[PDB]
A and B are shown apart, each in its own frame.
Chain A
């Protein structure tokens, strides 16, 4: 994941 990565930040949104």
Chain B
């Protein structure tokens, strides 16, 4: 399949080169997979989700996304126009309040929730979790992320936006998950992107168009935007049978575009997520 005039990040993840505008992907499109978006919620009523999104948990007075961040991330995973995996099932877990804040005990509860809740869902092709959030290092947050991964979920986490070593942030610093840095449309490391040995992969993260609350769209930037490209890519590859939740981060790194990015500090991987789709 070919989507013309796609957002640049979608075009990038199906290309060996920067500077193109068509997203190429197998029509299976993540059908039969599931992605949990652990964030501020998802506006499931957005036409872009086509009935494939739903809220499954909140820790606040409402499950509504009053912020937008979670809706945007979900759109990059799986919206019809803006998403990588256009037929995946999207499940929202609101661990962050409408101000974007979440206590670590709530984030941990939400990760343990997903590890259990997947057993209540139909995801024959596999399960992914996208965590575009974090804070300072916490062993308990990292352990929660490690348990979620161990339970059979492909966990993708944002590296953070401090232009610093991700080793000092959580869940970014948990080794066993897939820690995602951000790039821009000219194949530069995004200026804000964290880096370091704990990064597994980069994805598009600067000036990413996606869904927003109120049935709208907008372009924003962050490692938060890179993470759902990788989460969506994992769901897509799982549907194709190319990998599994335990192996997807390795598979994505194995099959990535190598050496394309600039301003990658010495000791950080130079790997950009790539679907290797050949019509």
Contacts and interface: CB of A to CB of B under 8 A. Distances in A.
Nearest to B169: A4
B245 interface: no
B101 A1 contact: yes
A3 B67 contact: yes
Contacts of A4: 132-134, 158, 160-161, 222-224, 227
A4 B231 CA distance: 15
B101 A2 contact: yes
Contacts of A2: 96, 100-102, 133-135
Contact of A1 (B133, B161, B223): B133
Most chain B beta carbons < 10 A, residue from A2, A3, A4? A4
Interface string B141-161: 100000000000000001011
Contacts of B132: 3-4
Interface in B238-270: none
20 contacts: A1-B95, A1-B102, A1-B103, A1-B104, A1-B107, A1-B134, A1-B141, A2-B100, A2-B101, A2-B135, A3-B67, A3-B69, A3-B96, A3-B100, A3-B133, A3-B222, A4-B132, A4-B133, A4-B134, A4-B223
